[PDB]
């Protein structure tokens, strides 16, 4: 028999809409054919009509649960082509908010996974924590989600006075919140029945199918771009990479919960090691000058005028730059033709290859398991469809 899954659950859900065409024999799933493009918005074409600065907000809206991490990936790619370097304080801020963003993503990933499986309550507890982290976003950028804060050259503005104290107070209590979540799920026999030995993927298959992030580490592969190909100041912080052993949904859930704990561990070092200095590269042909300078110095006014109309030119070249985003390897293949607008911008969304493996991972499972497998991949269709 043939069956089509609903676009989305009957409670608020923010992953997007999916048309899943399935072939069933009794309870068992024999074929899965995801039909995507329901949130395809031609982002990659629109970027070709934007300057490099104008295109930056598009990356907030890809994996719109990991906004600043997507900003970081694009900023690093442009900085590489520009051959410039963001100042050390900006790099620490980018790592600090990169890990705050990882917490935001992992709360959404773990709790909506549970919510779709029927465990509603943890979503409410942990989204109060998300609400407090939205306030950190809003205090640095003026926006709760699409901050547009991390830019090529550094960050847009320095932290307001008193923000780091508040991030410390939040971080001080967060591990307790994780513990409460683990009390509800980790040892629960119903949760384990829904996740243990579900969606097993071998280490060999995970690599060939293009998987990344937790979808690799759940199968025992020892890989994390923050460790192996570090960017910004990730080489200066200490943390452990959680590794699974069974390659199933339960191990991937444990990996995500432990990654949240390591993110707190990294945030702690960032709060203590934050250096002084400027927060964007001191090159006014790339980063706009301070407003006081723009209103006093002739050179500053010209460069402000040109950076906000033409934008900076980027030397011709192509780069593939990737980061360890919360959902996996997030990269951009960015082509510059020498002008102030990118010639081509291909976005590599980790969820694209993960969803392409849904049919492989769902073989020999039941219909209700398909919901669990989609959750364990942590799919957001803004990044899948672009």
């Amino acid at each position: 028999s043939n069956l089509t899954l609903n676009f989305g659950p009957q409670h608020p859900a923010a992953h997007g809409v999916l048309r899943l065409v399935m072939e069933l024999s009794g309870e068992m799933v024999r074929k899965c054919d995801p039909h995507i493009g329901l949130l395809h918005r031609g982002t990659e074409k629109l970027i070709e009509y934007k300057t490099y600065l104008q295109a930056l907000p598009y990356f907030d809206r890809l994996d719109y649960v990991s906004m600043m991490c997507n900003e970081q990936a694009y900023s690093l790619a442009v900085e590489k082509l520009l051959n410039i370097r963001p100042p050390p304080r900006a790099q620490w801020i980018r790592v600090l908010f990169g890990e705050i963003t990882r917490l935001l993503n992992h709360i959404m990933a773990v709790t909506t996974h549970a919510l779709d499986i029927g465990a509603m309550t943890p979503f409410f507890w942990m989204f109060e924590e998300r609400e407090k982290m939205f306030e950190f976003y809003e205090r640095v950028s003026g926006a709760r989600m699409h901050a547009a804060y991390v830019r090529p050259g550094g960050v847009h503005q320095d932290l307001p006075l008193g923000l780091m104290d508040d991030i410390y107070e939040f971080s001080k209590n967060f591990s307790l919140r994780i513990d409460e979540l683990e009390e509800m799920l980790t040892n629960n026999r119903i949760w384990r029945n829904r996740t243990v030995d579900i969606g097993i993927v071998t280490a060999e298959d995970a690599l060939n199918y293009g998987f990344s992030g937790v979808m690799l580490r759940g199968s025992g592969i020892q890989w994390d771009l923050r460790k192996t190909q570090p960017y910004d100041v990730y080489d200066q912080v200490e943390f452990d990479v959680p590794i699974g052993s069974r390659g199933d949904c339960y191990d991937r859930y444990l990996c995500r919960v432990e990654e949240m704990r390591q993110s707190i561990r990294i945030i702690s070092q960032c709060l203590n090691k934050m250096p002084p200095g400027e927060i964007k590269v001191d090159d006014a042909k790339v980063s706009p000058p301070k407003r006081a300078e723009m209103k006093t110095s002739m050179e500053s006014l010209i460069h402000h005028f040109k950076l906000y109309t033409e934008g900076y030119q980027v030397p011709p070249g192509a780069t593939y730059t990737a980061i360890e985003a919360p959902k996996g390897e997030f990269g951009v293949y960015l082509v510059s033709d020498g002008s102030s607008r990118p010639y081509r911008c291909k976005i590599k969304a980790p969820g694209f290859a993960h969803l392409a493996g849904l049919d492989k991972m769902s073989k020999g499972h039941m219909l209700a398991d398909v919901v669990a497998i989609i959750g364990t991949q942590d799919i957001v269709f803004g990044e899948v469809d672009r």
Partner: protein, 45 residues
Amino acid sequence: SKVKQDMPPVGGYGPIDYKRNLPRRGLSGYSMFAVGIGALLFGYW
């Protein structure tokens, strides 16, 4: 004027817990079964 920007306090922030903490509670397996069986015996009597 001195430079003034958001910085950590002198000496840094206090420690931040991050490791899992699920405390052990309750009796052992023997003790729980004994309590359950003793309750049945009193009920039967």
